[PDB]
Design a protein around this ligand. Structure first.
Ligand SMILES: OC[C@H]1OC[C@@H](O)[C@@H](O)[C@@H]1O
Length: 158
């Protein structure tokens, strides 16, 4: 089991970390969602599907910088929605194929009443997502740490 980014940055068997740089909608109104769909940028696969079933959860998702200050976060993991920042580990998603499958993580961020102006700064860390991988074969318990950075400013009209 290993993961790779849309651009080819890989975290190999055993886990590790990698940076993910996402384009964000440049203007988000109060009452709208800024969506950070990471399933288009994080892909993982099972290396031994003939024998092993891998289990994948979103163990923890943390908010930083402007997302922490200016947004109210919900994370949608494999079709279900949970608070973001997270308050529990998600259920497992089964990875049972050697073909790359998107990691089904999307963030839904809506501005708070106090938000206005440059609510997210270009190049800033906006989230850290911890993917936890286990299996039905051994005691493997690995963390793939995704640091999410904003490629651009996000302005909340005032
Ligand atoms: O993906 C199948 C297996 O690949 C080897 C090792 O990463 C295991 O943890 C994993 O379950």
């Amino acid at each position: 089991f290993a993961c790779k980014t849309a651009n080819g940055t890989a975290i190999p068997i055993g886990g590790g970390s990698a940076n993910v740089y996402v384009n964000l909608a440049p203007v988000v109104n109060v009452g709208q969602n800024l969506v950070v769909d990471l399933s288009t940028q994080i892909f993982c696969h099972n290396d031994y599907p003939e024998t092993i079933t891998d289990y994948v959860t979103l163990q923890r998702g943390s908010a930083y910088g402007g997302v922490l200050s200016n947004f109210s976060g919900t994370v949608k993991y494999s079709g279900s929605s949970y608070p973001f920042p997270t308050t529990s580990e998600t259920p497992r998603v089964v990875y049972n194929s050697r073909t790359d499958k998107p990691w089904p993580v999307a963030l839904y961020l809506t501005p708070v009443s106090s938000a206005g102006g440059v609510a997210i700064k270009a190049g800033s860390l906006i989230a850290v997502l911890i993917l936890r991988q286990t299996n039905n074969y051994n005691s493997d318990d690995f963390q793939f740490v995704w640091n999410i950075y904003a490629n651009n400013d996000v302005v909340v009209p005032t």
